[PDB]
């Protein structure tokens, strides 16, 4: 266990949070570059956190080019280290660095294609990610993008119930969840990806809400206040209110102006109100929008 830690040379701190720290590091014997995620255990002495349990157990089932590889787990008496492959940057910072130029449309298309492939793999393996946001999407110089951070991920051979606390950040949260539905479905991950597709295209967040009710009204104001025809059941749902403003759907070509007809179609289906009607990752991969997809490399301002 401690033999293993001494074979790593810490290079620099590349990430930090309530979860702990992430170091870039090198294997001194093999030369392998690596990301070490360090979780302190003495902070609650409640044992291994649920968030590590799910990330470790689920990630080691998932081997796919667009899902971050977990390389190893090292468990000492007070520290837990997860060893991951290293990638140069995340989508949030890259979008930010691309503000003046924009992300070229062919790179946007490649990224969405890759993200869907990774998500399809997750879902066909009964894993829900549940926290897809630009900061958990990692990229390298060769042009790949990968789903990362599976601390909130959940196996769903049995249906997964809604927690108030353990949720996607507000801007990427599906309407079903806001409206108080009972179970998560795969549809909630596709909703998140659709929001991110739009943000890459426009250079602004699609639905930057201030609160739960504000997030909803921003969705309603863009996509139209849903009704029983659009979405059977909506008016029954727990947190639905008859006093809701009834907004008309905005012209979709004015929401994502840079997109062609194929792009508009794909995003419509990714943002369908009814979770059962919302397109699946596997079916999205077949959409004509990906007819011509290629694999460009990003200008990483590293």
């Amino acid at each position: 266990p401690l033999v293993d830690m001494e074979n790593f040379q810490k290079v620099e701190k590349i990430g930090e949070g309530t979860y702990g720290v992430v170091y870039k590091a090198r294997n001194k014997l093999t030369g392998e570059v690596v990301a070490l995620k360090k979780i302190r255990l003495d902070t609650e002495t409640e044992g291994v956190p649920s968030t590590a349990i799910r990330e470790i157990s689920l990630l080691k089932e998932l081997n796919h080019p667009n899902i971050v590889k977990l390389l190893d787990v090292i468990h000492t008496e007070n520290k837990l280290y997860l060893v991951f492959e290293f990638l140069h940057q995340d989508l949030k910072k890259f979008m930010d660095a691309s503000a003046l130029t924009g992300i070229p449309l062919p790179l946007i298309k490649s990224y969405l294609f890759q993200l869907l492939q990774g998500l399809a793999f997750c879902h066909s393996h009964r894993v829900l990610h549940r926290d897809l946001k630009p900061q958990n999407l990692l990229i390298n110089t060769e042009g790949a993008i990968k789903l990362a951070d599976f601390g909130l991920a959940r196996a769903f051979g049995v249906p997964v119930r809604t927690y108030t606390h353990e949720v996607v950040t507000l801007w990427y949260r599906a309407p079903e969840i806001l409206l108080g539905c009972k179970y998560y479905s795969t549809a909630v991950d596709i909703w998140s990806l659709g929001c991110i597709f739009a943000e890459m295209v426009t250079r602004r967040a699609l639905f930057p809400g201030d609160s739960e009710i504000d997030q909803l009204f921003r969705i309603f104001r863009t996509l139209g206040t849903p009704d029983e025809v659009v979405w059977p059941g909506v008016t029954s749902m727990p947190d639905y209110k008859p006093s809701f403003p009834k907004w008309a759907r905005q012209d979709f070509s004015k929401v994502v102006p840079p997109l062609d007809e194929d792009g508009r179609s794909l995003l419509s289906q990714m943002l369908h109100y009814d979770p059962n009607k919302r397109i699946s990752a596997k079916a999205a991969l077949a959409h004509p929008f990906f007819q011509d997809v290629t694999k460009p490399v990003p200008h990483l301002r590293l």
Partner: protein, 258 residues
Amino acid sequence: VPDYHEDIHTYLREMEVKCKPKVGYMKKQPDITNSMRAILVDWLVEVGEEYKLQNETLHLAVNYIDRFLSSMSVLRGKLQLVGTAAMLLASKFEEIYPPEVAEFVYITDDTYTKKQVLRMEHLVLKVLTFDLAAPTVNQFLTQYFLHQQPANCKVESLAMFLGELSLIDADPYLKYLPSVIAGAAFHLALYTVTGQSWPESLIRKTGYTLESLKPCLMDLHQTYLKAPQHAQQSIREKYKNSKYHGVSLLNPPETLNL
């Protein structure tokens, strides 16, 4: 009717063969018996009712236990420490908000320390190589339920009940795959409440015929018959509650007409 429904069943059928405990581990154990185990599981069922945990949590913890005992010699007086750790891990994996360790120490009558429970959590995780996402009888029942014509809450409750009992007795149930136990529990519950049998749609889905389910079926039927005489009773009590339509009170057929 899900999107990845087929891909998932296929995946679970793969993983249930890999997470499979050693069939005859109990006799290579120096100190513990099927009976002690049965007492332990019956206890955890009780523990789950106390802290209002999901049924999947229970099934998972039992999977963790059988696998740990598949490779580690455990002594009588440490058996419940293994079981408590399994439940703690199960709760963390599956529950939205797991009970605190302090609760898991309390429910043991301070037979063990917070420190012992935490160390055992580490050792269980090490012995299982962090592979916690195991296929259970519940997971396969959930899949099978989509094939109800129509749904009958009574049938669902009763199948859950039969599957839950099968956890208690390592003999004969260790030698059957979850997908098979699930198949038998579903047919038996269906036949009891509605007089219908294993539907053609599920024969196509699973490849299981009533013929292939038979051995587990005969075993499960006996366990349903002798259920009220069994030394362990926590499950039958659980399932006479209204939450489960009192299905633990239904009288089993005296024969299955095979």
